[PDB]
């Protein structure tokens, strides 16, 4: 089929336009990937798709171990077969850094190299928010050249950017977000990302129902399995604004915040704001304990895993990087007293160890973000010290700036209701055995 895929819009688009899809698909494999390292691997794939539209495919594997950008352990694979790289998963960027420039940087920039321009612009694009699926990529980019290229030949400049913008803000919005949703996707893999997104929702809106909420975690996790990969047809834009109606009629009447994100003037602008809203004051109701009983074994159900995800989240004052990640060895735990010859006494056994695993996590997670949530940056740091000193007696104004400077970073990066998972799931590691 394929064997026949990459010469069919090889020969439909032709070199050039093939070449640009290229740039892109590339770009998006090596987020950590120069401008002239992906220009080069693309120059040779587009240059063998040419000819062999196998033998020269070897060419490249040998010559990588380089112009060629390099996947994290490359090195290994260079041992050979040989072909253990088209197996190294790349790992998502979770820090974009693109800046639009002003637009006479644009026209100037394309008047002078309208090749080079188009290229710098597609592979920045594509590194920084190579998570979106191909199709919303390709698309946004080929819009956003069409604009720049129209634009900066018109009559008017500065008024055609103005109304060509404005035409494109909801494609633009559609493809970073997508960036973003898809990127916590593909970190957690959908069952992770099920139950994060269950449990960001139940921190948003502790007053719910498990029935209010499970339907919506649900709902985006199908959404983002269907919808991040998509090599030409695009389906983020046609199932997006489904979802923010069933986001708002479940929650919006539960919150005030969420009633106002339903009166966005586009279903990308309510998504967004409820996207953002933070982790609202949990009501704290009583402790609820581990799932230990049977009922957890449903393969067809997570019925009694999510009950308890959700009452844990909003009971317990902890970002979901950390919930996500200690749930995730707690439920796998529990789940293995279910194919075993006496589950009720594999239960009652397990069940005391991980309590008491659980609150140690859990209690060293609040004692990272203590004081974090409920303040202003700068208060915050504030507190932090009066924390920090209190705690080290004998420390100097400069051990304590240190501490200060490493803790609140790492607050500001893995504290927050929306923290990068790949980023935090390290440094979580790493702060847990601190202090
Ligand atoms: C970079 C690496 C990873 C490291 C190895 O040493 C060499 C290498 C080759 C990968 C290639 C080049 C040949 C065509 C392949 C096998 C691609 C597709 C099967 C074909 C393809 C190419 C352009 C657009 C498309 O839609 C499809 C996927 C990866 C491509
Ligand atoms: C460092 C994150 C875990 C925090 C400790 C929580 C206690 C969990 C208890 C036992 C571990 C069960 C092993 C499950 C394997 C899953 C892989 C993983 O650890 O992420």
């Given at each position: 089929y394929e064997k026949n895929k990459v010469c069919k819009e090889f020969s439909h688009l032709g070199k050039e336009d093939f070449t640009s899809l290229s740039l892109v698909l590339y770009s998006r494999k090596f987020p950590s990937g120069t401008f002239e390292q992906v220009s080069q691997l693309v120059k040779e794939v587009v240059s063998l798709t040419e000819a062999c539209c196998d033998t020269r495919t070897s060419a490249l594997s040998a010559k990588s171990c380089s112009p060629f950008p390099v996947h994290p352990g490359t090195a290994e694979c260079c041992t050979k077969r040989k072909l253990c790289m088209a197996a190294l998963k790349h790992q998502p960027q979770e820090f974009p850094t693109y800046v639009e420039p002003t637009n006479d940087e644009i026209c100037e920039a394309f008047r002078k190299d309208?090749?080079?321009y188009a290229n710098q612009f597609m592979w920045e694009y594509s590194t920084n928010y190579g998570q979106a699926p191909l199709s919303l990529l390709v698309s946004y980019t080929k819009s956003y050249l069409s604009m720049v290229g129209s634009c900066c030949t018109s009559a008017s400049p500065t008024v055609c950017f103005l109304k060509?913008?404005?035409?494109?803000?909801?494609?633009?919005?559609?493809?970073?977000?997508?960036?973003?949703?898809?990127?916590?996707?593909?970190?957690?893999?959908?069952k992770k990302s099920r139950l994060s997104n269950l449990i960001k929702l139940a921190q948003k809106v502790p007053t719910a129902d498990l029935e209010d909420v499970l339907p919506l975690a649900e709902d985006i996790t199908n959404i983002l399995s269907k919808c991040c990969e998509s090599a030409s047809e695009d389906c983020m834009a046609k199932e997006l604004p489904e979802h923010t109606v069933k986001l708002?009629?479940?929650?919006?009447?539960?919150?005030?915040?969420?009633?106002?994100?339903?009166?966005?003037?586009?279903?990308?602008?309510?998504?967004?704001?409820?996207?953002?809203?933070?982790?609202?004051?949990?009501?704290?109701?009583?402790?609820?304990?581990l799932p230990t009983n049977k009922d957890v074994c449903?393969?067809?159900?997570?019925?009694?895993?999510?009950?308890?995800?959700?009452?844990?989240?909003?009971?317990?004052?902890?970002?979901?990087?950390?919930?996500?990640?200690?749930?995730?060895?707690?439920?796998?735990?529990?789940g293995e007293c279910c194919?075993?010859?006496?589950?009720?006494?594999?239960?009652?056994?397990?069940?005391?160890?991980?309590?008491?695993?659980?609150?140690?996590?859990?209690?060293?997670?609040?004692?990272?973000?203590?004081?974090?949530?409920?303040?202003?940056?700068?208060?915050?740091?504030?507190?932090?010290?009066?924390?920090?000193?209190?705690?080290?007696?004998?420390?100097?104004?400069?051990?304590?700036?240190?501490?200060?400077?490493?803790?609140?970073?790492?607050?500001?990066?893995?504290?927050?209701?929306?923290?990068?998972?790949?980023?935090?799931?390290?440094?979580?590691?790493?702060?847990?055995?601190?202090?």
């Open positions: 309208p090749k080079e060509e913008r404005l035409q494109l803000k909801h494609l633009s919005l559609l493809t970073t977000l997508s960036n973003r949703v898809c990127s916590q996707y593909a970190a957690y893999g959908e708002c009629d479940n929650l919006s009447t539960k919150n005030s915040k969420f009633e106002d994100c339903c009166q966005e003037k586009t279903a990308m602008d309510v998504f967004v704001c409820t996207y953002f809203m933070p982790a609202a004051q949990l009501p704290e109701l009583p402790d609820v304990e449903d393969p067809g159900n997570t019925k009694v895993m999510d009950k308890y995800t959700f009452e844990l989240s909003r009971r317990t004052h902890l970002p979901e990087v950390f919930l996500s990640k200690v749930l995730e060895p707690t439920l796998k735990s529990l194919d075993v010859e006496d589950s009720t006494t594999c239960f009652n056994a397990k069940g005391p160890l991980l309590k008491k695993e659980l609150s140690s996590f859990i209690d060293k997670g609040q004692e990272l973000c203590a004081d974090y949530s409920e303040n202003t940056f700068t208060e915050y740091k504030k507190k932090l010290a009066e924390r920090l000193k209190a705690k080290l007696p004998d420390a100097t104004p400069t051990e304590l700036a240190k501490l200060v400077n490493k803790r609140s970073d790492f607050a500001s990066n893995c504290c927050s209701i929306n923290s990068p998972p790949l980023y935090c799931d390290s440094e979580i590691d790493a702060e847990l055995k601190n202090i």
